Amino acid sequence: DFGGFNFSQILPDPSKPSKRSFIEDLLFNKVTLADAGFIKQ
Amino acid sequence: PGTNTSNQVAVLYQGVNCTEVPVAITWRVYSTGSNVFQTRAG
Ligand SMILES: *[C@@H]1O[C@H](CO)[C@@H](O[C@@H]2O[C@H](CO)[C@@H](O[C@@H]3O[C@H](CO)[C@@H](O)[C@H](O)[C@@H]3O)[C@H](O)[C@H]2NC(C)=O)[C@H](O)[C@H]1NC(C)=O
Ligand SMILES: *[C@@H]1O[C@H](CO)[C@@H](O)[C@H](O)[C@H]1NC(C)=O
Numbered sequence: 466d467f468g469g470f471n472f473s474q475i476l477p478d479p480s481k482p483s484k485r486s487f488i489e490d491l492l493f494n495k496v497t498l499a500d501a502g503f504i505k506q
Numbered sequence: 507p508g509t510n511t512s513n514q515v516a517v518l519y520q521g522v523n524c525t526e527v528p529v530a531i532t533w534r535v536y537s538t539g540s541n542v543f544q545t546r547a548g
């Protein structure tokens with residue numbers, strides 16, 4: 466009850482395995498990385 | 507930790523998988539194990 470203001474799209478989403486928000490997921494999807502370097506999985 | 511705190515140390519093999527060090531077996535006494543722990547860093 467934030468006086469009618471909405472923060473759902475920027476607050477964490479518990480459903481996903483990662484606790485990123487909707488917009489954070491959008492940003493991570495948009496930016497593409499290279500040379501992961503994660504035990505060369 | 508600090509040298510005067512203790513002479514005990516731990517060794518991290520960056521980007522190395524915990525099977526390669528046993529496979530190899532430079533000091534190698536630490537390769538015996540009993541404390542091997544695979545992390546995302548090595
Ligand atoms: C606060 O955050 C946003 C907008 O400020 C709202 O998101 C969407 O709001 C409506 C009803 O409020 C609902 O839309 C429905 O979502 C379901 C689940 O994804 C979807 O299947 C439907 O087709 C429909 O789109 C839903 O609550 C929510 N999600 C979507 C995709 O729109 C939110 O409702 C606002 N609520 C609060 C308490 O602040
Ligand atoms: C290590 O630093 C000084 C000198 O070695 C010593 O006085 C101090 O007690 C030691 N620190 C710890 C946490 O043991």
Ligand SMILES: *[C@@H]1O[C@H](CO)[C@@H](O)[C@H](O)[C@H]1NC(C)=O
Nearest residue numbers: 504523524525526544545546
């Ligand atoms: C390499 O390390 C990962 C854990 O980060 C492990 O899942 C995988 O089995 C290892 N690959 C081997 C030993 O070939």
